[model samples]
Target: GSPEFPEYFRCPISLELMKDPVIVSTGQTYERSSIQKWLDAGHKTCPKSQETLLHAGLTPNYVLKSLIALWCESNGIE
Candidate 1:
């Protein structure tokens, strides 16, 4: 890793940069793939919030995606 990615732009699950950002029922943001796998693994709680999810639904966090893109541009990265 070169320049570190912003903490907010990373998934708490895998700690990898998010390719597809999504916000769960709680206020935490995570990558769709990471959370999806967690849900599929039968975990009913958010990894960060430790709150139970009534259901598994992923809402896209395009705002964060745009911010990440801006950061990339500013960092001279594609």
Candidate 2:
């Protein structure tokens, strides 16, 4: 059975469930690797915020991570 999850649990960049959710200064969340790649590509602005990114690193969203794990487990999504 296909598992259905909240859209907030998804990565805007990859359009897939965020396995590693990280928060940017813009207060937007995205999958770690996807945002890293964007930053690596010299992106100055956040995709969701449309504002300049002052920092290059990401902050892990532990709460979101736990929620995602629970949702995945309960939904039988490996």
Candidate 3:
């Protein structure tokens, strides 16, 4: 069965589930690679605050990480 998770656990860019979320200064967490990709495109400037995505946090939400980790393991991926 598909599992249900918090929207906060998803990536804004890919619009998919993510385990590598970085807390942006804007208080919105985003995916790791996605940020670099945005930088490559010189995208964002999310416009929330002047520094919406100016930078990002290095740590991913390990709480969610461990939770998702348990699901992935319990569900068994091929």
Candidate 4:
């Protein structure tokens, strides 16, 4: 089972959905400009903290993980 995605989960960059999210592996957690860079680069950042988020640390958020899984699963490329 998966949690439903809140309206806020959608990406601000592509405005479509999050795909291939990559945590920046460095930097402050609340800097929007910093995390936005990662998001703009086709990656999703932490919504509340604005941290460059890691998949490992994030999967428990079913909405986020489900979305990512949906993207990869639909493409049949993963």
Worst 10 residues of 1 by lDDT: 69-78
Q: Which ranges of candidate 4 are over 4 A from the true structure?
A: 1-8, 25-63, 70-78
Residue-level lDDT of model 3, residues 1-78, one tens digit each, is 754443345444554545555555556555566655664565545423446565544545455655544444655421
Candidate 2 clashes between residue pairs 3 or more apart in a chain or in different chains = none
Compose the digit string of candidate 1's lDDT tens values, residues 1-78.
665443456555655656557876765566777777777787768785578977767778777877655554555432
Worst 10 residues of 2 by lDDT: 2-11
Ranking by TM-score: 2, 1, 3, 4
After superposing candidate 2, which stretches have Cα over 4 Å from the reference?
1-7, 72-78
Q: What TM-score would every model get versus the actual structure?
A: 0.66, 0.68, 0.48, 0.25
Q: Clash number for every model?
A: 0, 0, 0, 0
Alpha-carbon lDDT, every model:
0.65, 0.66, 0.50, 0.42
Q: Which stretches of candidate 1 lie over 4 Å from their true place?
A: 1-7, 70-78
Ordered from best to worst lDDT, the candidate numbers read 2, 1, 3, 4
Better of 1 and 4 by lDDT: 1
lDDT of 3: 0.50
- lDDT-wise, the better of 1 and 2 is 2
**For candidate 2, lDDT tens digit of each residue in 1-78?**
744333356555645556667877777666677777777787757876468878766778776887666655655443
- Tens-digit lDDT track of model 4 for 1-78: 863442323344333444444333432222233345556677655554555555413222233545555654655422
